[PDB]
Amino acid sequence: ITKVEAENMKIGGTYAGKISAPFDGVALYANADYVSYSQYFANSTHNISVRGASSNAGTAKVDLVIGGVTVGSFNFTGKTPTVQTLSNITHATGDQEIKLALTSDDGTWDAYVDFIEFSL
């Protein structure tokens, strides 16, 4: 299992920044916010989990982008952190950018991101 902490990734956008609550991680608030890093892959398919939370009782949605492809979105509804999963995602091998960003600007609340975990 490969786990990467959001707070150790590149943080970009107008608003995004490291957080300590509701965990050590990064918050994403508006469309151009992101976290990213480069991951080497030997295999073309993984299960991907992210621990995250919403800023509010309602929904925050986070796109997962691998090598520029939006492969799916994690739904974090409510203030309590959960682990959300995208299973059996195929992608390119070798060095690939991994990026997390809000799915919308106005459609959803803000996302808190703790870590990402890849597994086979």
Q: Which does 33 bind (CB under 5 to 8 A by kind): Mg ion, Ca ion, none?
A: none
Q: Does 115 bind Ca ion (CB under 5 A)?
A: yes
**φ and ψ at residue 7, rounded to 5 degrees:** -65, -10
Q: Does 52 bind Ca ion (CB under 5 A)?
A: no
Structure tokens at 53: 């939370």
34 is in an annotated binding site: no
- Interacting residue with Ca ion among 11, 13, 19, 24 (CB under 5 A): 24
Neighbours of 75 (CB within 10 A): 15
Sheet with 10-12, side-by-side order of all strands? 10-12, 34-41, 94-102, 59-66, 69-77
Q: Does 33 bind Mg ion (CB under 5 A)?
A: no
Cα–Cα–Cα angle for 109, 112, 117, nearest 5°?
130
Q: Smallest gap, in angstroms, from Cβ of residue 44 to Mg ion?
A: 34
95 is in an annotated binding site: no
106 is in an annotated binding site: no
> Which residues of this chain interact with Ca ion, rule CB under 5 A?
5, 24-25, 114-115
Residues that bind Mg ion (CB under 5 A): 29, 110
